[PDB]
Design a protein around this ligand. Structure first.
Ligand SMILES: CCCCCCCCCCC[C@@H](O)CC(=O)N[C@H]1[C@@H](OP(=O)(O)O)O[C@H](CO)[C@@H](O)[C@@H]1OC(=O)C[C@H](O)CCCCCCCCCCC
Ligand SMILES: [Mn+2]
Ligand SMILES: [Mn+2]
Length: 239
């Protein structure tokens, strides 16, 4: 089987989430063929050169699972799009670009964090375009570590303020973007996170049934989607 998780937002001051995650690694990821982490794995990331002791311990926990034979794939989210090759080397995982199409039991499956689908949120679309601009990435990595933390705190503050003011349909995926992006990648299945609204959505693409599976966030309970050749199930479990 294969496991999909996202939106853990791991941080030193949420040991309840960390403990649930490590137990999940021991009890389920170790026995899986592969684990996919579809963004927002950490609460924030300023660059691999800024990794703290907590984040290094998480890398070491992933590495134990990777060394056991489980293939681990990590995709950026909007909290942690600065994760790089040094982290993945320590963690024994493979960095997957957003978007990525994988082969899952013979089916092409599209994987994304999900925030790129939130095209009705023009303020966020503008921020994302700036944050991912190579010129922005260039100047950001020239900031001292402490100053990067400052700017990350400022982005979190403004995001918390602004997101509270937005309507639900502004922060969720744009409905018409789903068939558009899925058709472009030639898939009938899309798995993403970001929206913190775990669900499976059936839809039509060109007169054919398709599905969009949304992974749950870990603020109140853990979540995992498990797929094998015979079926799939996403279910929560207590922290
Ligand atoms: C190099 C290291 C330091 C710098 C890089 C650090 C990178 C890590 C920081 C992560 C911040 C991230 O939370 C911002 C973000 O993505 N917010 C959108 C997202 O909310 P999440 O809660 O993150 O899922 O998803 C929400 C739902 O889709 C969406 O609503 C949020 O987006 C916003 O709220 C954005 C606001 O609409 C616009 C904010 C503009 C802020 C500008 C601040 C600086 C201005 C200073 C000018 C003087
Ligand atoms: Mn998230
Ligand atoms: Mn997100």
């Amino acid at each position: 089987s294969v496991l999909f998780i996202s939106d853990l937002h791991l941080e030193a001051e949420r040991p309840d989430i960390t403990r649930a995650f490590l137990s999940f690694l021991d009890e389920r990821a170790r026995r899986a063929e592969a684990l996919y982490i579809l963004g927002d794995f950490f609460e924030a990331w300023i660059g691999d050169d800024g990794m703290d002791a907590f984040q290094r311990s998480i890398a070491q926990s992933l590495r134990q699972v990777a060394d056991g034979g489980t293939r681990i794939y990590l995709m950026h989210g909007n909290r942690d799009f600065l994760i790089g090759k040094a982290f993945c080397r320590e963690a024994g995982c493979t960095l997957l670009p957003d978007p990525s199409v994988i082969d899952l039991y013979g089916e092409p499956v599209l994987l994304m964090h999900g925030d790129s689908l939130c095209t009705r949120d023009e303020a966020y679309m503008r921020l994302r375009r700036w944050l991912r601009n190579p010129l922005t990435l260039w100047v950001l990595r020239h900031l001292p570590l402490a100053t990067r933390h400052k700017l990350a705190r400022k982005l979190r503050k403004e995001s918390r303020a602004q997101t509270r003011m937005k309507a639900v349909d502004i922060i969720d995926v744009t409905p018409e973007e789903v068939p558009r992006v899925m058709r472009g990648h030639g898939v009938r299945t899309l798995i993403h996170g970001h929206t913190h609204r775990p669900a499976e959505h059936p839809l039509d693409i060109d007169g054919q049934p398709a599905r969009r599976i949304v992974l749950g966030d870990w603020d109140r309970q853990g979540w995992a989607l498990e797929i094998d050749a015979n079926g799939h199930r996403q279910a929560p479990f207590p922290l």
